[PDB]
Amino acid sequence: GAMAPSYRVKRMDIAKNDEECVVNAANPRGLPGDGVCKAVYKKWPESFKNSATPVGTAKTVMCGTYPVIHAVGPNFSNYTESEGDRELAAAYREVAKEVTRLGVNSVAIPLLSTGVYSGGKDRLTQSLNHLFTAMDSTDADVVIYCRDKEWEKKISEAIQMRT
Ligand SMILES: O=C(Nc1nc(=O)cc[nH]1)c1nccs1
Numbered sequence: 001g002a003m004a005p006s007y008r009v010k011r012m013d014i015a016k017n018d019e020e021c022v023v024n025a026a027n028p029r030g031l032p033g034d035g036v037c038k039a040v041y042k043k044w045p046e047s048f049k050n051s052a053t054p055v056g057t058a059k060t061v062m063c064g065t066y067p068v069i070h071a072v073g074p075n076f077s078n079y080t081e082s083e084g085d086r087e088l089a090a091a092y093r094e095v096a097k098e099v100t101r102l103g104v105n106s107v108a109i110p111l112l113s114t115g116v117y118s119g120g121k122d123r124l125t126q127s128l129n130h131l132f133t134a135m136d137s138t139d140a141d142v143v144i145y146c147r148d149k150e151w152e153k154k155i156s157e158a159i160q161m162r163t
């Protein structure tokens with residue numbers, strides 16, 4: 001584990017992360033997808049061999065020795081707010097189990113269900129709070145990746161408020 005486990009946020013492409021493993025914001029079918037998923041497919045295509053997994057679950061596939069944890073958040077265009085909220089929390093709990101099993105000291109993670117699966121709603125606080133509920137009990141350094149300047153500021157404020 002990390003000596004003083006922390007949370008940090010960076011505004012850049014998660015395919016350029018400086019962590020020991022990456023979480024992909026995957027689709028259930030293991031397809032190349034869009035946004036973060038397409039960036040992950042271009043950088044670690046080998047990790048999409050048998051990566052299909054249901055909504056609310058995570059499945060890790062190695063690219064060489066580098067772990068890619070495919071986490072499938074719900075698409076809020078298809079799910080109700082109550083059911084989608086439950087599956088989003090579940091996907092993050094499965095990421096925490098995989099990060100612990102892998103024994104890594106750091107992990108790069110995007111905010112699940114905040115892009116094309118958001119159903120057109122701002123889900124920064126919802127998704128980040130489920131990330132903290134799952135990852136708080138792990139001892140890996142967590143680095144959250146985002147692309148929007150206003151989101152970077154809001155995620156950074158949420159991390160600093162708890163310290
Ligand atoms: O690209 C994104 N998510 C996503 N992409 C897919 O193709 C299928 C499911 N989820 C994200 N970008 C930023 C935060 S999540």
Ligand SMILES: [Cl-]
Pocket residue numbers: 012013016
């Ligand atoms: Cl970049």
Ligand SMILES: [Cl-]
Pocket residue numbers: 146147148151
């Ligand atoms: Cl973003």
